[PDB]
Symmetry: D2
Subunit: 247 residues, 4 copies
């Protein structure tokens, strides 16, 4: 079995494939653009991916990798009543370039199922796009589309640290996204079955994507403080994983 | 920083400390009694712990260990209307002995804050005891008492597998327990800020504890299929990604 | 696959099975005796082991585990010309009791092969015993016998830290023991073929064994500063020594 | 602390930087040329490196990273009496290019110390150069030059697998490089004190480098069958146990 693993407690420019407004500055992974004062700017799109590709499944041996990612993100909107849009962990084709800004998070083109994207993502959405989004703040699981196949309720705490964990288990095809605001003691969890072999190609890049809305007033940051990742392609420990990274 | 880590994919008698009705069979950790026909028995009590005690907070340096457990359990009852009582993952003192069966899960004495017990547990409750319990089947966090300081809705699936992840973070003091029934794709989480120094002793036995009800009819299985655990005590002043792939997935 | 791992950067009494003169003081494992002024005492016999037993091979599946261990030890004799005897890493049966003192290190009865012991050990030899030992100080692989099946030259520097790495890989049945004295930038290594199914039982205790001599002058300290250990029992692969040695000390 | 780890048990083109004759076929990283029929070729040079750079020391906090690497290689010659030249594990500048072929192993320019290369390499030497090498096959710690700052006798076993472990402990500045031949139960070890801060840049690429001789007759294969590497860089001021099993 092949392995690949890495833990960032601070972010470095030199080991990431940066795309658009996503830039590293003072340890933090600022995916969107903040003005001189620090106040977030509208119409921003950023993408950041890990330097080495990851094989998530094999064509010949028919085996599927199990993986896990953990990171702490912080969305800071000056006015909670008008923010946009969100941030997402994404597994994306290796030489793949950004898509639609705004409520498409720079990952998808449309709401209808277009497998040509070959994109799985877990979205953390602050802005309710009636076009596809559910009633309130949610954690979505995105497969080829920005219309999330399964979402969960989210108490978005403004400018407060969110620790996340995402795990894929090959033996059950299950995907689990969890989120905690330690400062507020609020916890959340979504779970869904996903076939990686039908969605993503054998080799994918791994990282983040985040955007701000269309309207000028509708501003928020999209900051990731730390990031840990592990993958195991069989030919995946959880207890010994989040302690070298998260804990 | 000191480290401890193990991943049972199948339970073995040889590297656990079994108390009461707890018994290892065909790789399962059956913590409550089952008849010859494979039928859950009433009035049962079990306990299974790890063979090394664990330092969770160091008095001299005031440091606190960050730790993570993951395990798959399975509770099968014949009659959903009358089951009892549930299983629990707990951190007990080094040389701890079992306590009250039934609605106490062999871990606690009374509903009031009894600091003399020194026990932190994450329960998985099936039987509702009005006196202390909430309405529906719940995940509960037990500190020095059976009356959980926080609870949440857990939609108990009968005879189904439940993958469980429980993490304590030292820098945030936050204990987070999360459950998934992969057959149903249903997920359940509860998190509460807990201070270990105030509650638990320096060294602790990490493991399981489970019970059945007062009456004949109130029977269920209290079984653990597999188990992973890791800990990290910082010497001067814990990955969640590489932990559950060596164990859970 | 099944997994067990721990890192001792500082030792503690409670997660250790201690036998005879073996003691733990201020974060150090003093396997042999010491005075209050700091003088090694003769006729000392120490053995310390990890609490949780370890399945090294599984009868039914016919699989043999692959394990690695890395530790730091210091051997300080007052008079270097007359030292005795040395320490050893040893895989011993779970209920085993310390054996013959002196150059037998507490692990064997005779120089001739006797399978009733069921013991694999890697010895670090300061005192050359004419009957079995080769001339110079050595690292020896001991199979049920105090006479090593293979040895290699060792420049034992008195009172210095010695980082050791012992690795067993089942796919080639190869045990590789290596020692570095980082103070004088010296390095030594030994390798031989060993079948664990024959020599050792299924479950074992893993730890240390050290002794002092017979004479009032043949004394040395036998101390272990830090200790790492990991093992992997497969269901139906080599051990990652790259990620281990860093996730060790 | 910051961590990076991986474990190739079969090589893939998709997550490596390949240079010159270096090639991946059927999961075995072949560094130098081998003919269709399996015949090794002279005048070859290969280099393979991991896709992510690795921070071995941080300037701002003075923190230096401990690391470890394990890989199994096989060298096979038609004629053991005349092979060339060898292969080497190296920590290399973030965008470096292959240097002198042949006796220099595609890594160095000359026998004298030139810290412009910024290259720590552990070499595995088949061909004794009467210019800088000891009189036999050797493992050698190379620093900014092809002539080793320390060596040890290696009993090169023709067409036999060789497991290698290289470990750098930053709490002792000690680099230890070993090699075992599992088919013949033989082992070899070298250990020298190397200060990375005066040798290598903050960020380095991590990988392999090999060559064959100038003469046509002097042929061998330079193959790596598996690979593991781990690193740990702290914020302030490495378990070989868990690594070596969690490795290959
Ligand atoms: Ca949206
Ligand atoms: Ca109850
Ligand atoms: Ca002796
Ligand atoms: Ca040469
Ligand atoms: Mn959405
Ligand atoms: Mn309850
Ligand atoms: Mn000897
Ligand atoms: Mn050379």
């Amino acid at each position: 079995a092949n392995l690949i693993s890495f833990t960032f407690k601070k972010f470095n420019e030199t080991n990431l494939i940066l795309q658009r407004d996503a830039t590293v500055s003072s340890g933090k992974l600022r995916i969107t653009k903040a003005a001189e004062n620090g106040v977030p700017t509208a119409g921003s799109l950023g993408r950041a991916f890990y330097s080495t590709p990851i094989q998530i499944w094999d064509n010949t041996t028919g085996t599927v990798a199990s993986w896990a990612t953990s990171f702490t993100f912080n969305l800071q909107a000056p006015n909670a009543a008008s923010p946009a849009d969100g941030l997402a962990f994404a597994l994306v084709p290796v030489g793949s370039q950004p898509k639609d800004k705004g409520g498409f998070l720079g990952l998808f083109d449309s709401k209808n199922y277009a497998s040509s994207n070959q994109t799985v993502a877990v979205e953390f959405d602050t802005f309710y796009n009636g076009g596809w989004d559910p009633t309130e703040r949610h954690i979505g699981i995105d497969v080829n589309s920005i219309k999330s196949i399964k979402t969960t309720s989210w108490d978005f705490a403004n400018g407060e640290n969110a620790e996340v964990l995402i795990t894929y288990d090959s033996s059950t095809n299950l995907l689990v996204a969890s989120l905690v605001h330690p400062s507020q003691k609020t916890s959340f969890i979504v779970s869904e079955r996903v076939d990686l072999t039908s969605v993503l190609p054998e080799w994918v890049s791994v990282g983040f994507s985040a955007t701000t809305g269309l309207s000028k007033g509708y501003v928020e940051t999209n900051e990731v403080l730390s990031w840990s990742f592990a993958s195991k392609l069989s030919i995946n420990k959880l207890a010994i994983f989040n302690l070298e990274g998260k804990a």
